[PDB]
């Protein structure tokens, strides 16, 4: 996370670290959406252009953590995967369209004071909360510069409007992605960066006191570049498919 700050422990429970078995290595972010299901970006698993293609027997997940390195023995939970479901129409060749994935846990998870899911978006919430200017939040252990935090980081970024996102890149943008970030004249900074990928962009709803997962960190042209915004997967819209895998 570029231009963020340390998070208060217990800030983001639904924050999984997508780690690799050997040699140990962080690959991305993901989130807890249940006690057996994890959501992440598909490019974290399959991205052919870089020879990247992971199997269930290549990863682990360290659910519920704070210090990126010091394995906090009696508060954190490691787990192996059972399955990996990657959207079947995920465009990795062109624009990273539908860059979503659902990771199954070998066996369930003992929710704790530092582990618990994040709410998925329902039609009603999505409608009232997805408006430009409306800020959501990103957490992650990835680089703080285009160099890595000792603790989880946070940055709260505004949803930019559809036309401005499209005007900044030359990438065909789809219904399934939105962007967030500050525009050049705001003199406020922030962005996700390498390794924050797959992490969650959550927004809090005023009606009840719940946090919803609005989007999955996907791509960007650098990290915290002026006149460039960060793209996130539109969870609500791919939620139809989410139901299909968890069923």
């Amino acid at each position: 996370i570029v231009e963020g700050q340390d998070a208060e422990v217990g800030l983001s429970p639904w924050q999984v670290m997508l780690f690799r078995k050997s040699p140990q290595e962080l690959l991305c972010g993901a989130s807890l959406i249940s006690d057996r299901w994890v959501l992440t970006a598909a490019h974290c698993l399959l991205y052919p252009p870089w020879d990247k293609n992971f199997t269930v027997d290549d990863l682990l997940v360290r659910i519920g953590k704070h210090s990126r390195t010091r394995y906090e023995r009696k508060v954190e939970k490691i787990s192996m995967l059972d399955k990996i479901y990657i959207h079947p129409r995920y465009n990795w060749k062109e624009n990273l369209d539908r860059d979503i994935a659902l990771l199954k846990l070998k066996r369930p998870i003992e929710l704790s004071d530092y582990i618990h899911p994040v709410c998925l978006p329902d039609k009603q919430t999505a409608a009232k909360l997805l408006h430009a200017g409306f800020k959501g939040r990103v957490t992650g252990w990835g680089n703080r510069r285009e160099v890595q935090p000792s603790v989880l980081q946070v940055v709260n970024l505004p949803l930019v409007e559809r036309p401005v996102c499209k005007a900044s890149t030359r990438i065909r943008i789809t219904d399934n992605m939105f962007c967030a970030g500050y525009k050049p004249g705001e003199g406020k900074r922030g962005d996700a960066c390498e390794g924050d990928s797959g992490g969650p962009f959550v927004m809090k709803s005023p009606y009840n006191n719940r946090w919803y997962q609005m989007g999955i960190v996907s791509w960007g042209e650098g990290c915290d570049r002026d006149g460039k915004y960060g793209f996130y997967t539109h969870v609500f819209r791919l939620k139809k498919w989410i139901q299909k895998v968890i069923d």
């Binding site: 618990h116 709260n156 809090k204 006191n209 719940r210």
Partner: peptide, 29 residues
């Protein structure tokens, strides 16, 4: 319906250092 509510925060009735921040942008301008 136990999703979204942070034990160390929501369930305890405590606000995080920058949560305020997000709530302003809602009633913005």
């Amino acid at each position: 319906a136990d999703c979204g509510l942070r034990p160390l925060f929501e369930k305890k009735q405590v606000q995080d250092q920058t949560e305020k921040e997000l709530f302003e942008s809602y009633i913005e301008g």
